Design a protein around this nucleic acid. Structure first.
Ligand SMILES: [Mg+2]
Ligand SMILES: [Zn+2]
Lengths: 54, 66, 1316, 288, 251
DNA sequence: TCATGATCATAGGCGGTAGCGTGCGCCAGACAGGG
DNA sequence: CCCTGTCTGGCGTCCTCTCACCCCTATGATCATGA
């Protein structure tokens, strides 16, 4: 899930007590700055199907 | 030394029945090493006669018929 | 004077030291700690109030709501202890808490809440403690054992020698908090100073000093002195105090006042320091090479350029002096960095530091804690304030603050639970002082650094962990809901609290199953100081030093009672007089020896207060005033024994029994046994079993009554008085009038505990030992328990022993026993086994317990009733049917193959809804009838006591001698009597009587409810049938008997009566030991116990001779008085002139089977007293009778030692170890036989036995030992056919477990095969 | 502890003496526990390094064996020749010092009669065939092993000797523990080994070697005393001489390393510049 | 395994395989319905870490657990160490026709024989007794013979004295240190429940009689009886293999 | 007849808006730090 | 590249006997009672 927030002044362990928290997209130790490809160049989709998986 | 002399064998079942089994089986896996049951403890593992007592006469017969 | 049960059989007592402090209540650790835990405790601490006031008030995530705390309260348990052990529930009490919710408004958190709500809430069930000191967790009586762990506070250890392989010792300073993050300062071989937090990555230590907002100038102001250089007209002169120059070789000629003081090439002597400080020399002259390496303290800035001349903590060169000299600075502050005095450890540490201000230090600490993430100044401030400086995540206790102030030489032992700046700076100062060479390091095993937790503190900690999980739930829910509509029981839930405390009391490493087969084993399992468990060390890792007795275990922890094996010295047992201090340390009594006189005041010393003073040894001779009769007396000063003068002593020990525990103070003649054999004797005395009729110890220590009464197996009288009705079931005491309440008229009923199962399958019985009409005093035994007799402690039985080799049947350690022992039924112990049978719920329908059973006939079903369950009383064999059970297929319960017995008790529990069959209704009618009769007899007996009170009141004041019994007895109130105390008392007794009437109504209704209701049970079970078999195991060749000194042995042959060596009177000896176990296994105490036991029986035989001839009481009085005086200055001093001619006959009725003799531990009966007591009887002086032989009938040469030894049967029997298997069941994953005895299994032919058969030439034996007999399934069916057809031959095949090895290696990416 | 226990078990022991006895006893028990823990693992590693070695031939056919001499620590002879060369096949055939007269042939098992005939003639060093110097590929021949221990005859072709060897070494591991001059006793000839000696001005024999070993040859050939002799030690005797008992024949300084010479001449300084190579440190309270 | 409570406390392997199959099915579904650009990566990291938990748990950083602190068992924890297939199931096995009890002295024995109970000798030697019963013709099938020797009628003790007679057993003390720790005797039937063991022989076992327990094994086949008579008998091993000292020293 | 409340049955992996870990020890061989 | 320190992997007796313990908590759905 895509969430907008700001890292340093608001430290995470305070906000930990809630959901939305498994961990960042990383590919590495640091919380990786993610692209928003859907937001920027891929807004409206799911024409794959509505297969309603299985 | 005796633990390194026992881990450095041409028979991976002896060196697996002794200390670390992971390192011995990976080295013998990538080397394609081929045990031939070679003495006492591999034959205790596999369930046949020890080549020491009466099984020594049996193993001389078996090796002579090879 | 003596109590009335002490006039039954008064034990003869040797012993010389007059006691001054009696043995305390031996179960005070458990009971006092758990009373400290659960009690309404004001002023905050300790108890549950500490947890409820440290985790509350829960305040929300800025939603202005707050859940604060009021009080708590425990209701009564729904089940008392007996119903709880029968049914199987926890013995718990519900914990009601009064919580309050307040909800603040907007723009004013300092403003008024709009609404509050205070209410009762249910959370958890904490299990209570029984009066014995034990818990009942799931019907099984368990003990939580005290833990010995490290005391919170600072600790300056020294990693000696081993590191860096160059002998340079390190020094670390571990701050041990009670709860929070650890902190280890240390050194390194480059002499830098390194901090670490919770064994994580390592940083240079001064990075935390910047984190406390210290500039570097202030740091060098703290950790070093200053050296002043004044530039006054000539070569940059110096202020010099010569104490820094103690042993330093100068680089020039130090002169002052026109006088040469110090020469170049020499050092400054101490007398040259005296010269320079006597002449008051201040300014001396230095060269240009003297300040070549002096380290500046603070920053100097040039006023013109505004730049930095030289940075702080920098050595000075020529150009730096040239820069600061022409800028206008005349004062130069440097540091003194010596080789021996003050190393520049802080200076090298600051030179390794990359950081420069507070922010960079907080960033680096935040980065070593949580690796690889963006720090922010707010996050770094929050983390470093929540490591050490917050009331939440960091808390030294009061113990921690005491050790932290004491080990830093502070004054106030009170402080906050959090650290501060001065605390860490004092830790670094003391660490640098230890590195400099002054002061000492602290050892670990010293008992001033080992605290004792107990039941209360550990239950408080587990309950606190439950509360922080629930505050992690309440902080979630409180600011994420609609307010005000909810109440504080919809928020807080009882699942984590009850789960935490139930997991601690249920399965911890210290909440262990009580070894209960003996009163001694109970009372020494409850007093145990275990070092293991959470927070302590582990068995297979550590170590050497902790398994060793430190010099400060003297009088706190017993040195000789510890289990041998893999954990020696970790499962320490606490001593006799050893209390526990206010903080948790150990303390022991002493006697304050003022300057000449031993004052009889007791005075408790801890483990560190003992070291400073000087303590006299326990048995030092003193002449009736306290004046020490020698002028050199053996004492111990600072952990080291020595010989001191008469009146430099400050304390004396109280009694000579205080080094040992209660396990090893019932051993007579302990000072004669070598310590290994005393250890094995104490451990086997714990492992005894109760016999059928326990006798007494003839040679005891007088400590038996403390262990019997101060445990919970006997029925101690609460209020004294006169016995009214004795029975094998109950005992009724009528309370004396000078001990009695005005109301609640009162005659007490003791319901004894008859034949029921213990934990070790023994038979915990209680027998009444009082007669009828007999007076009893307050604090006195009424009913003996298991292994007790008249209030004493009788573990085994005392038998006639002889030390001689007898034809090899006692070769190594074996014991040879006459048939006279087994004929008298005197070791015949009684065991009880519980066999359960559940009616589960499966497919095709539920099960059947009824007796309409297939595949069986008359011969099985004759021992069952018409509803499957065996009768009560049917003596069964091994393999009959007890409960008949058939599934939608015979699955009836059977007696396991081997054991006999007699079914004594059958329980049937029914899950509610299921149809009760006819026998469950029979048990329901039976228990209804029993409880009906019992409560009706409660009402009748207490009404009889009440009417006896009415008769006692109406003796005076309007007495009616004839008119009293003309009317019915329930109206004894409206007789002629005015308004006095007597009509008031009759009104109070009418109040009591109507209370008993309505109470009897409501309690009989509640008891019918308890019998009639069902019970909550397992998921999917109909009914549980429990049957109690009662085996009676006698004795046989193979059991283990042992004395009380380590003389073990398997009894090897049960001889006839005739073969025994007899003496020239006629009596056969009962047991023939082996003499050769004495000089090697040095337990010489058993031979003194043997001789003194023969003396005791000689006095008993003379009493039996003087009483069997029907002699008058005068001669009995004469002889009993001569046998009770007989010694040196002793403590007993009895006289029979105040026993009045009827007690003397009954005392001789109790002495005729021998005279009991007390022998205290280290103040016992010497050799000459045993000789003088063997001279009172007509026995030979040397103790040795000449003995004839039974076989040959001719005399043994060189007369042998006979006497009585008190020998114990241990419960390592031989028909519990013996096992045999031809072909049984086989395991599932690897087709090998199962393991154990209950599972019908085979013995493990282990690896070293495979080596021992490779070592011979046995090849076919090993092939069938690991292919045919064990693993290969087709091989073993071929083998079984071949054996029952007579063809001894094996078809080998392959082990199936090798195919399992192939599948497990093959299930990896590895391709193992079998070639050719 | 400097104040001993002056009381025995027949008399009493008071409290402190029994406490000190408890120090000793619990130290012993913890030693036995961790001692067993190490001993079992030692037996495991030895039977897993040997594990395989089976007596698989009947004669290898080599000569080179090890030299069995009685061990000499420097006092009494600890382990004699009969208890070392009992039952092991000789490497080179022993010739009695009636040289070119054979006493035993070179493949004779030395049982008890032969060991007594070795003790009578005082045989120096029976060079004998050891297992470590064998020649059998994939196993050990029968003659280089020796007598079948636990029996009397030679070892049978087949008995796994690695396993019995590893058990015999590791089995007493339970019993084991875990945590100025040269004074002569006997009398005989004097032997020196690996010595570079020279004559002093006093007439004695001084040594210029650390590797000097002194030996006492007895009357019949063997050695009953051996002494490691330090560097630059001074002998009161020489090589091949005769001494008496109780006579200290050597003396040195264990604190000082002597730099004694060979030729007689003046002493000068070469490459010894004062201030750098040598320093001026005057001994203050003595003078020299 | 069932624990007889309506639930299955599962083995650790099924938990590990279940985790791999959960994570793999979720990764197949996420590769099906398209991954959000730089997204089809976290799920593959999770799958790699679950397989590394299955093949060798704990070798990668912090191991997993089911309950509560103890790390659960992977495949390499079933092959390695103690409690694994090399040292617990393949080099030393549990063995049928065996029994164990407490030892005692009985000095009336010759040194090639030991006392052994009637109950142990009847339970070790069952199929021998079955063979003698249907060879002498006292039971038709095997089931009648089994019920005869379960009832212990008066004839099977003669059968048992006719099968013990020249048939060795192996006695074994539980810490076998050297090769004299396994020896072979010829049994003598004892009324009682202990193993009477010759005293001189107890020099080799390092066995006193303060509660020691020894285990007896039976050689089934014929070659094993000859090896327990010619190689391992108590009269043959009178010398130790460590030296030439006798091991029958009178104690 | 409809709505609300209470009780019973069935269903998953730090619990939380952080931090827990802390009392083994040796050897050994590779990986890397310092120079 | 040549040491020299750190790091993380290995390993730490055998056989037997006994005992306990082996989800509870939360959410959703259905049924009953009251308005
Ligand atoms: Mg023993
Ligand atoms: Zn050879």
């Amino acid at each position: 899930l895509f969430v907008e927030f700001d890292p340093e002044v608001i430290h995470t362990t305070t906000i930990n007590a809630t959901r939305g928290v498994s961990h960042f997209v990383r590919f590495g130790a640091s919380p990786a700055i993610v692209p928003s490809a859907v937001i920027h160049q891929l807004s409206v989709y799911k024409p794959k199907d509505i297969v309603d998986p299985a | 030394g005796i633990t390194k002399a026992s881990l450095a064998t041409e028979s991976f079942i002896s060196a697996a029945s002794f200390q670390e089994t992971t390192r011995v089986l990976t080295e013998a896996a990538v080397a394609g090493k081929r045990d031939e049951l070679r003495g006492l403890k591999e034959n205790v593992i596999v369930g046949r006669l020890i080549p020491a007592g009466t099984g020594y006469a049996y193993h001389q017969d078996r090796m002579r018929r090879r | 004077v003596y109590s009335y049960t002490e006039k039954k059989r008064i034990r003869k007592d040797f012993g010389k030291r007059p006691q001054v402090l009696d043995v305390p209540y031996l179960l005070s650790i458990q009971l006092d700690s758990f009373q400290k835990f659960i009690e309404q405790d004001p002023e905050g601490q300790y108890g549950l109030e500490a947890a409820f006031r440290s985790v509350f008030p829960i305040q929300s995530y800025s939603g202005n709501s707050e859940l604060q705390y009021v009080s708590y309260r425990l209701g009564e348990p729904v089940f008392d202890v007996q119903e709880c052990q029968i049914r199987g529930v926890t013995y718990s009490a519900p914990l009601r808490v009064k919580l309050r919710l307040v909800i603040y408004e907007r723009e004013a958190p300092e403003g008024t809440v709009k609404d509050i709500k205070e209410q009762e809430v249910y959370m958890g069930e904490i299990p209570l403690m029984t009066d014995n000191g034990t818990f009942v967790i799931n019907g099984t009586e368990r003990v939580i054992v005290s833990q010995l762990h490290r005391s919170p506070g600072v600790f300056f250890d020294s990693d000696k020698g081993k590191t860096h392989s160059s002998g340079k010792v390190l020094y670390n300073a571990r701050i041990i908090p009670y709860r929070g993050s650890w902190l280890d300062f240390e050194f390194d071989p480059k002499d830098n100073l390194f901090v670490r937090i919770d064994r994580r990555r390592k940083l240079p230590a001064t990075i935390i000093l910047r984190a406390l907002n210290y500039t570097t100038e202030q740091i060098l102001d703290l950790f070093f002195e200053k050296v002043i250089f004044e530039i006054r007209d000539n070569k940059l002169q110096m202020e010099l105090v010569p104490e820094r120059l103690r042993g330093e070789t100068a680089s020039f000629d130090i002169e002052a006042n026109g006088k040469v003081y110090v020469e170049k090439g020499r050092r400054i002597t101490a007398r040259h320091i005296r010269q320079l400080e006597k002449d008051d020399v201040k300014l001396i002259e230095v060269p240009v090479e003297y300040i070549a390496g002096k380290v500046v303290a603070k920053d100097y800035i040039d006023e013109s350029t505004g730049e930095l001349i030289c940075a702080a903590n920098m050595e000075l060169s020529l150009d730096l002096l040239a820069k600061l000299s022409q800028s206008g600075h005349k004062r130069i502050e440097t540091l003194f960095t010596n080789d021996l005095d003050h190393g520049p450890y802080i200076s090298e540490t600051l030179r390794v530091d990359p950081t420069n201000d507070r922010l960079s230090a907080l960033v680096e600490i935040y980065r070593m804690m949580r690796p690889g993430e963006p720090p922010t100044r707010e996050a770094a401030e929050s983390l470093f304030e929540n490591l050490f400086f917050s009331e939440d995540r960091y808390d030294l206790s009061a113990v921690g603050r005491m050790k932290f102030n004491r080990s830093l030489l502070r004054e106030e032992i009170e402080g906050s639970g959090i650290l501060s700046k001065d605390d860490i700076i004092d830790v670094m100062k003391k660490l640098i002082d230890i590195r400099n060479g002054k002061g000492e390091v602290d050892d670990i095993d010293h008992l001033g650094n080992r605290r004792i937790r107990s039941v209360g503190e550990m239950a408080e900690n587990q309950f606190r962990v439950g509360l922080v999980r629930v505050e992690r739930a309440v902080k979630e829910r409180l600011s994420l809901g609609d307010l005000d509509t909810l109440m504080p029981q919809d928020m807080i839930n009882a699942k984590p609290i009850s789960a935490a405390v139930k997991e601690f009391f249920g399965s911890s490493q210290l909440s262990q199953f009580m070894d209960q087969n003996n009163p001694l084993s109970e009372i020494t399992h409850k007093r145990r100081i275990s070092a293991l468990g959470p927070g302590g060390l582990t068995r297979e890792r550590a170590g050497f030093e902790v398994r060793d007795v430190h010099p400060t275990h003297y009088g706190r922890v017993c040195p000789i009672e510890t289990p041998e094996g893999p954990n020696i010295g970790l499962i320490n047992s606490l001593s006799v007089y050893a209390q526990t201090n206010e903080y948790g340390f150990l303390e022991t009594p002493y006697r304050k020896v003022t300057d000449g006189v031993v004052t009889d005041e007791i005075h408790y010393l801890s483990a560190i207060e003992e070291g400073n003073y000087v303590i006299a040894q326990a048995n030092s001779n003193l002449d009736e005033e306290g004046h020490f009769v020698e002028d050199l007396v053996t004492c111990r000063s600072k952990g080291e024994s020595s010989l001191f003068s008469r009146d430099q002593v400050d304390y004396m020990d109280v009694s000579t029994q205080q080094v040992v525990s209660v396990g090893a103070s019932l051993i007579p003649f302990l000072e004669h046994d070598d310590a290994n054999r005393a250890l094995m004797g104490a451990n086997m005395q714990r492992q005894a079993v109760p016999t059928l009729r326990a006798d007494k110890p003839l040679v005891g220590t007088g400590m038996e009554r403390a262990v019997a009464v101060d445990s919970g197996v006997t029925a101690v009288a609460k209020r004294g008085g006169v016995v009214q009705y004795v029975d094998a079931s109950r005992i009724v005491i009528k309370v004396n009038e000078d001990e009695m309440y005005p109301g609640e008229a009162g005659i007490d009923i003791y319901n004894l505990t008859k034949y029921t199962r213990s934990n070790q399958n023994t038979c915990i019985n209680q027998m009444p030992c009082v007669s009828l009409g007999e007076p009893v005093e307050r604090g006195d035994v009424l009913a003996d328990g298991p292994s007790t007799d008249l209030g004493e402690l009788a573990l085994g039985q005392n038998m006639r022993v002889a030390f001689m080799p007898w034809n090899g049947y006692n070769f190594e350690d074996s014991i040879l026993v006459s048939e006279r022992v087994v004929q008298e039924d005197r070791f015949t112990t009684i065991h009880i086994q519980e066999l359960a049978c559940v009616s589960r719920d499966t497919k095709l329908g539920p099960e059947e317990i009824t007796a309409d059973i297939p595949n069986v006939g008359e011969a099985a079903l004759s021992k069952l009733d018409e509803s499957g369950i065996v009768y009560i009383g049917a003596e069964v064999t091994g393999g009959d049917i007890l409960v008949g059970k058939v599934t939608p297929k015979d699955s009836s319960l059977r007696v396991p193959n081997g054991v006999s017995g007699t079914v004594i008790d059958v329980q049937v529990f029914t899950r509610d809804g299921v149809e009760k069959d006819k026998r469950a209704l029979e048990i329901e009618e039976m228990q209804l009838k029993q409880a009906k009769k019992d409560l009706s007899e409660e009402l009748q007996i207490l009404e009889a006591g009440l009417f006896s009170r009415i008769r006692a009141v109406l003796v005076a004041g309007g007495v009616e001698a004839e008119k009293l019994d003309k009317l019915p007895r329930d109206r004894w109130l409206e007789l002629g009597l005015t308004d006095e105390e007597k009509q008031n008392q009759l009104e109070q007794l009418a109040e009591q009587y109507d209370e008993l009437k309505h109470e009897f109504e409501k309690k009989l209704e509640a008891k019918r409810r308890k019998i009639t209701q069902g019970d909550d049970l397992a998921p999917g079970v109909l009914k549980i049938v429990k049957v109690y078999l009662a085996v009676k195991r006698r004795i046989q060749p193979g059991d283990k008997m042992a004395g009380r000194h380590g003389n073990k042995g398997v009894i090897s042959k049960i001889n006839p009566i005739e073969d025994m060596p007899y003496d020239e009177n006629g009596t056969p000896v009962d047991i023939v030991l082996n003499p050769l176990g004495v000089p090697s296994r040095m337990n010489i105490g058993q031979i003194l116990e043997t001789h003194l036991g023969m003396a005791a029986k000689g006095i008993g035989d003379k009493i039996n001779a003087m009483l069997k001839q029907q002699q008058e009481v005068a001669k009995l009085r004469e002889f009993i008085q001569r046998a009770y005086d007989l010694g040196a200055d002793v403590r007993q001093k009895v006289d029979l002139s105040t026993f009045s001619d009827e007690e003397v006959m009954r005392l001789a009725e109790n002495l005729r089977k021998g005279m009991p003799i007390a022998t205290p531990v280290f103040d016992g009966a010497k050799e000459a007293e045993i000789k003088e007591l063997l001279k009172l009887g007509d026995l030979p002086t040397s103790g040795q009778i000449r003995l004839y032989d039974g076989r040959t009938g001719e005399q043994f040469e060189r007369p042998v030692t006979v006497g009585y030894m008190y020998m114990l049967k241990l419960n390592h029997l031989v028909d519990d170890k013996m096992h045999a298997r031809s072909t049984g069941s086989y395991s599932l994953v690897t087709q090998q036989p199962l393991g154990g005895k209950a599972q019908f299994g085979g013995q493990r032919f282990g690896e070293m036995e495979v080596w021992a058969l490779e070592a011979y030439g046995a090849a076919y034996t090993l092939q069938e030992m690991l292919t045919v007999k064990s693993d290969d399934v087709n091989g073993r069916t071929k083998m079984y056919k071949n054996i029952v057809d007579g063809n001894h031959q094996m078809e080998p095949g392959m082990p199936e477990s090798f195919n399992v090895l192939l599948k497990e290696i093959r299930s990896l990416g590895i391709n193992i095969e079998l070639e050719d | 502890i400097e104040t001993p226990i002056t009381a025995n078990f027949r008399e009493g022991l008071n409290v402190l003496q029994y406490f000190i006895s408890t120090h000793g006893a619990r130290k012993g028990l913890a030693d036995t526990a961790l001692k067993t823990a190490n001993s079992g693992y030692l037996t495991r590693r030895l039977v897993d390094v040997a594990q395989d070695l089976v007596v698989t031939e009947d004669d290898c056919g080599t000569h080179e064996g090890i030299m069995m001499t009685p061990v000499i620590e420097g006092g009494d002879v600890k382990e004699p020749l009969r208890d070392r060369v009992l039952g092991r096949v000789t490497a080179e055939d022993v010739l009695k010092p009636g040289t070119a007269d054979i006493l035993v042939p070179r493949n004779t098992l030395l049982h008890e009669q032969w060991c007594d005939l070795l003790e009578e003639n005082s045989v120096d060093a029976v060079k004998v065939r050891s297992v470590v110097s064998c020649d059998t590929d994939f196993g050990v021949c029968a003659h280089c092993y020796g007598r079948d221990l636990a029996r009397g005859h030679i070892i049978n072709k087949g008995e796994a000797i690695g396993v019995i060897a590893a058990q015999s070494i590791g089995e007493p591991g339970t019993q084991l523990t875990m945590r100025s001059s040269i004074q002569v006793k006997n009398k005989g000839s004097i032997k020196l080994s690996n010595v570079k000696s020279v004559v002093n001005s006093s007439g004695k024999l001084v040594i210029t070697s650390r590797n000097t070993e002194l030996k006492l040859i007895d009357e019949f050939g063997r050695t009953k005393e051996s002494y490691k002799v330090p560097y630059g030690a001074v002998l009161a005797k020489g090589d091949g001489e005769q001494v008496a008992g109780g006579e200290t024949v050597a003396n040195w300084d264990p604190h000082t390393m002597p730099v004694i010479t060979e030729v007689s001449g003046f002493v000068r300084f070469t490459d010894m510049i004062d201030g750098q190579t040598i320093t001026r440190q005057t001994d203050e309270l003595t003078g020299l | 395994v069932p624990l007889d409570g309506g639930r299955f406390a599962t083995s650790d392997l099924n938990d590990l395989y279940r985790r791999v199959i959960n994570r793999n099915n979720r990764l197949k579904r996420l590769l099906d319905l398209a991954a959000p650009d730089i997204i089809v990566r976290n799920e593959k990291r999770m799958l790699q870490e679950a397989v590394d938990a299955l093949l060798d748990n704990g070798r990668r950083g912090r191991a997993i657990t089911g309950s509560n602190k103890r790390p659960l068992k992977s495949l390499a924890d079933m092959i390695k160490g103690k409690q694994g297939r090399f040292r617990q199931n393949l080099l030393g096995k549990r063995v049928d026709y065996s029994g164990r009890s407490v030892i005692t002295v009985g000095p009336y024995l010759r040194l090639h024989q030991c006392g052994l109970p009637k109950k142990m000798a009847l339970e070790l030697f069952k199929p021998f007794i079955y063979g003698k019963l249907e060879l002498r013709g006292l039971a038709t099938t095997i089931k009648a013979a089994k019920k005869m020797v379960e009832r212990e009628e008066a004839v099977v003790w003669d059968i048992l004295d006719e099968v013990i007679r020249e048939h060795p057993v192996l006695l074994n003390r539980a810490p076998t240190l050297h090769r004299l720790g396994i020896q072979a005797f010829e049994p003598v039937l004892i009324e009682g429940k202990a193993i009477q063991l010759h005293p001189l022989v107890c020099a080799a076992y390092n066995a006193d009689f303060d509660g020691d327990q020894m285990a007896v094994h039976v050689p089934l086949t014929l070659e094993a009886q000859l090896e327990a008579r010619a190689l391992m008998m108590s009269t043959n091993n009178i010398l130790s293999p460590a030296n030439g000292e006798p091991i029958i020293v009178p104690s």
